[PDB]
Amino acid sequence: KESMKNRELKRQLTVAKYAKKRAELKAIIANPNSSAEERWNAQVALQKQPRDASASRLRNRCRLTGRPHGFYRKFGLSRNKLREAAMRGDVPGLVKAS
Amino acid sequence: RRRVAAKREVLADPKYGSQILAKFMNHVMESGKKAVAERIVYGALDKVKERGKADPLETFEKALDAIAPLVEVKSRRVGGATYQVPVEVRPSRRNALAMRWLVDFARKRGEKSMALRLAGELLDAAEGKGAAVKKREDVHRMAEANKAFSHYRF
Amino acid sequence: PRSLKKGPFIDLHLLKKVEVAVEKNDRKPIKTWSRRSMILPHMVGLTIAVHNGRQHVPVLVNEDMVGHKLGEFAATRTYR
Amino acid sequence: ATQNYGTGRRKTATARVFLRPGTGKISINNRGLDQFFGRETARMVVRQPLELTETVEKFDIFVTVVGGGVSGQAGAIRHGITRALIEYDETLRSSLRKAGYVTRDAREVERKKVGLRKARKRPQYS
Amino acid sequence: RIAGVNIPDNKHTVISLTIYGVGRTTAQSICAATGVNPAAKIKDLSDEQIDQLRNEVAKITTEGDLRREINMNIKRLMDLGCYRGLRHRRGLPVRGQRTKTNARTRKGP
Amino acid sequence: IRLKAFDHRLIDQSTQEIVETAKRTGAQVRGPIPLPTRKERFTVLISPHVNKDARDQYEIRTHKRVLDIVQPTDKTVDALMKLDLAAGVEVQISLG
RNA sequence: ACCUCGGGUGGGCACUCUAAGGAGACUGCCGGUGACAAACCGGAGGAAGGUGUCAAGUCAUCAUGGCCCUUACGGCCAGGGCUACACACGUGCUACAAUGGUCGGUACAAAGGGUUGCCAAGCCGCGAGGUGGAGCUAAUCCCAUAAAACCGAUCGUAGUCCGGAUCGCAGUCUGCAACUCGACUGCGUGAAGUCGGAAUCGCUAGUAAUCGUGAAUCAGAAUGUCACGGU
Structure with missing residues (x-):
């Protein structure tokens, strides 16, 4: 596949393309200070202003392989790296103990 | 085939002053709580004699009379019919069937006081007229047809 | 969840052939390009067809509807 | 003086005995034995070395040991009876082999094994 | 009529209401401040303290009206x-x- | 002084260059306050076929140390901030 | 000393607060067996002493063929049609109505990741801790509340006053996307749980065995193998 690994990877600069209207429209909704006439003004926000402004369709993978499973928070890499990284020494502090 | 285990009985009861009774908290402990077990380990022995007139170590000791068998029920081959093995055995066998099956009839009584439905059978062995005494006399006269099979074909 | 924390439905781009089409008579079905797209609670009695890719279903809407999705006119798994 | 340091340990403890001679007085964890405990039998299991060393008239024992469970460091009162007393004298030295209550049992819950269910409690197989 | 359906005795008074489905933590204040004692049965006390514990039957839903x-x-x-x-x-x-x-x-x- | 260092072997060799080189200059710096092993167990898969019976054990350690200088004037904390690393030690400092 | 006897705090380096790393556990020794010999039986001290295999899942997460789509699976806004109950079951927590049928209470869990995060005592509460925010780089804390105990009530042993499967409608929290369907279990209702027998999962020592997981590429419903089953 070639038209797959370079069309959802570009979500780094398109999901936060605006990035300044996306925070000026999503905090005071969590505030009840909006008036009873003002249910509508905060809802001209992000959808027909072209709809790459939400983030429900992004997924975390590996870098050099691209495996979504086995991905953790302490790496940008996946389950087929940990056996072959710190023995060549690509990961700090990963030491066997008990 | 070697027996490698070492028999380590640990008997020291904090208040009760028994000889053979102390460590028995194993089927009174129903995989649960010890504070639930406090009126039924010794508090039920403080509940046996409360309708009786003795010490609760009197009636407990004499379970080695009539609910303890004489012969053993293990099966053996020669070339034919599978022969069981009747023999005079050391107390670790016959009195092992004089303590744990005496308490095992506790569910078909189902009365008030959880503490009483475990130890409401122990005082029936003064004459020996309870539940575990019926099966012990079944053993002896289901051992007539076997008692000569100890050396010859055994 | 799915309570009435969201009271109204003010959605602007799902609207501009719906709220404008009040003065115009009802002679054409309003076609929909989603399995999600909903419309007002004060327009009650329009026609929306379940959008997935092969053929359309009978959709009958009366005055007493308040609750949930359009997933009942055609089913989720329609027993093929 | 008799101002010493003994320690009983069940479930990774570090105890404090404020020990002195006296007449058989017991106390535990800034409390008495009739004060924190009760509704158990594990209080006078420690009686079994206590009345056989005949120190029921000679010492004051306050072994604070914390942690564990309900009756878990009721297994620590088992240990700390004669540790801070055999650092005084050598009378009851060879007279305590019959009990055997000092060895911190390492057959407790050790490292966690995957594949099984618990330490060495095996799962269902065919 | 008395609790809608004929009621077996020799059991509890609050649990005579808490009869399959809407109750006890809402009737937590009903049986405690009316004065009607939970400590005894629906009959053996005075037979008069049921009159408001019977009116709750025909106000919202009934054994006959749930069939409606x-x-x-x-x-x-x-x-x-x-x-x-x-x-x-x-x-x-x-x-x-x-x-x-x-x-x-x-x-x- | 608080750091942010790796393990047992790159703080017990990094605090040797701190306290003696700060005692040389006529000042009084306290001794090392310990910190045990950061217990966290790690579980991943290693089998080429997908297998639930196969897990294992890993760990990354995280060891820091509490120190403090009594008379704060030391150039041992600012000038010997560039010395107290070798390859990837990141020495945070505190003026305590 | 003090304290609200929760220790504001000096002092806690000795009558310590979870140790980085460490002499670490024996063929060590005497004696009866055996060819004296491997071992095997017994005693030390001391509240510690003997442990290279089974023509079968992937020309497909790196690899690699005989034919192919070749105005095309180079076009994608895709005009919806994958569970008639008509069964055996790989069956494998839960009870046998009596320790008896419904809670807000006990000496009581409580720290880390924490610069697009974790989300107080909540004012809200029967039980919802959205505006609040003690903690914003956590010997801090947000889920912060809790442990199967006393004698727990009326009444003392039930296929039922454990019983609710389509008829929660409908209640100021992601926020442009809840028009005949979701947590919020408040118990007015609509059941099948009675010694496991035909025969077989399978238990010789820490074991057969019923108290829970906190944290992302920086947005918190990842259940048979759950950080501690205190037996």
Whole structure:
């Protein structure tokens, strides 16, 4: 596949393309200070202003392989790296103990 | 085939002053709580004699009379019919069937006081007229047809 | 969840052939390009067809509807 | 003086005995034995070395040991009876082999094994 | 009439109300401030402290009146071609439970 | 002084260059306050076929140390901030 | 000393607060067996002493063929049609109505990741801790509340006053996307749980065995193998 690994990877600069209207429209909704006439003004926000402004369709993978499973928070890499990284020494502090 | 285990009985009861009774908290402990077990380990022995007139170590000791068998029920081959093995055995066998099956009839009584439905059978062995005494006399006269099979074909 | 924390439905781009089409008579079905797209609670009695890719279903809407999705006119798994 | 340091340990403890001679007085964890405990039998299991060393008239024992469970460091009162007393004298030295209550049992819950269910409690197989 | 249906005795007074379905933590203040004692039965006390514990029967829903609208709203789901009556025509769980086959207490015979 | 260092072997060799080189200059710096092993167990898969019976054990350690200088004037904390690393030690400092 | 006897705090380096790393556990020794010999039986001290295999899942997460789509699976806004109950079951927590049928209470869990995060005592509460925010780089804390105990009530042993499967409608929280369907279990209702027998999962020592997971590429419903089952 070639038209797959370079069309959802570009979500780094398109999901936060605006990035300044996306925070000026999503905090005071969590505030009840909006008036009873003002249910509508905060809802001209992000959808027909072209709809790459939400983030429900992004997924975390590996870098050099691209495996979504086995991905953790302490790496940008996946389950087929940990056996072959710190023995060549690509990961700090990963030491066997008990 | 070697027996490698070492028999380590640990008997020291904090208040009760028994000889053979102390460590028995194993089927009174129903995989649960010890504070639930406090009126039924010794508090039920403080509940046996409360309708009786003795010490609760009197009636407990004499379970080695009539609910303890004489012969053993293990099966053996020669070339034919599978022969069981009747023999005079050391107390670790016959009195092992004089303590744990005496308490095992506790569910078909189902009365008030959880503490009483475990130890409401122990005082029936003064004459020996309870539940575990019926099966012990079944053993002896289901051992007539076997008692000569100890050396010859055994 | 799915309570009435969201009271109204003010959605602007799902609207501009719906709220404008009040003065115009009802002679054409309003076609929909989603399995999600909903419309007002004060327009009650329009026609929306379940959008997935092969053929359309009978959709009958009366005055007493308040609750949930359009997933009942055609089913989720329609027993093929 | 008799101002010493003994320690009983069940479930990774570090105890404090404020020990002195006296007449058989017991106390535990800034409390008495009739004060924190009760509704158990594990209080006078420690009686079994206590009345056989005949120190029921000679010492004051306050072994604070914390942690564990309900009756878990009721297994620590088992240990700390004669540790801070055999650092005084050598009378009851060879007279305590019959009990055997000092060895911190390492057959407790050790490292966690995957594949099984618990330490060495095996799962269902065919 | 007394609790709607004829009532067996030799059991509890608050649990005579807390008779399958709406109750105890809402009637936590009903049986405690009316003065009606939970400590004894519906008969053996004075027979007069039931008169407001009987009026709750015919105010909201009744054993006869629960049968009134047990077919109106189900008629709203069967011939309207909808999906609450697509797994009522079949008999499955409806509100999105363990879905297809091997379900314990939702299908029946 | 608080750091942010790796393990047992790159703080017990990094605090040797701190306290003696700060005692040389006529000042009084306290001794090392310990910190045990950061216990966290790690579980991943290693089998080429997908297998639930196969897990294992890993760990990354995280060891820091509490120190403090009594008379704060030391050039041992600012000038010997560039010395107290070798390859990837990141020495945070505190004026305590 | 003090304290609200929760220790504001000096002092806690000795009558310590979870140790980085460490002499670490024996063929060590005497004696009866055996060819004296491997071992095997017994005693030390001391509240510690003997442990290279089974023509079968992937020309497909790196690899690699005989034919192919070749105005095309180079076009994608895709005009929806994958569970008639008509069964055996790989069956494998839960009870046998009596320790008896419904809670807000006990000496009581409580720290880390924490610069697009974790989300107080909540004012809200029967039980919802959205505006609040003690903690914003956590010997701090948000889920912060809790442990199967006393004698727990009326009444003392039940296929039922454990019983609710389609008829929660409908209640100021992601926020432009809840028009006949979701947590919020408040118990007015609509059941099938009675010694496991035909025969077989399978238990010789820490074991057969019923108290729970906190944290992302920086947005918190990842259940048979759950950080501690205190038996």
